[PDB]
Amino acid sequence: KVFGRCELAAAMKRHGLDNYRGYSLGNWVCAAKFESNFNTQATNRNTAGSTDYGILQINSRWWCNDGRTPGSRNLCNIPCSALLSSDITASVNCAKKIVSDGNGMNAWVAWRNRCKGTDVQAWIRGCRL
Numbered sequence: 001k002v003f004g005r006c007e008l009a010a011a012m013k014r015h016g017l018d019n020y021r022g023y024s025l026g027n028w029v030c031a032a033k034f035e036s037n038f039n040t041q042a043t044n045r046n047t048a049g050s051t052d053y054g055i056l057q058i059n060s061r062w063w064c065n066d067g068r069t070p071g072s073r074n075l076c077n078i079p080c081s082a083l084l085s086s087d088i089t090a091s092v093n094c095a096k097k098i099v100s101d102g103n104g105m106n107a108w109v110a111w112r113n114r115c116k117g118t119d120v121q122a123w124i125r126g127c128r129l
Helices: 005-014 025-036 089-099 109-114 120-124
Strands: 043-045 051-053
C-alpha cells in the first residue's frame, strides 16, 4: 500500500506509536515520509551488503533477516520479507524494539536529518484521530 499521510497517522496510532517512548505521532509520520514516502513495499540498498525494507526502511544488518546480508543479527526476529506487507504491524513492532535500544529515533538517519528539530506535529495536522 502507499498510504496517505492521515491514513498512516491513524494506523500508526492504532498500533501504539503515538508517544511511544516519548515520541509524538508526527515524528513517526515524518520518519515514514522521508524513509519510504509512505510506501510499504519500498526497498533500498545500503552498505555492507544490507538492504532497508518497508515503510520505516528497517535494515537487514541488525534488525531483520533477509538471507543475504553478511554478518547479520536479526534483533527483531523477523524475516525482512515480512516487512514488505501493506499491514504495518511487523514494521511497527520492530520499530518499537529499535527505538528502545538506547538511542531513540536517532537510528533513522532520514528522521535525524529531515524531521528531528522541526515542527513534527504539522505531520498530523488536519487528521481525524
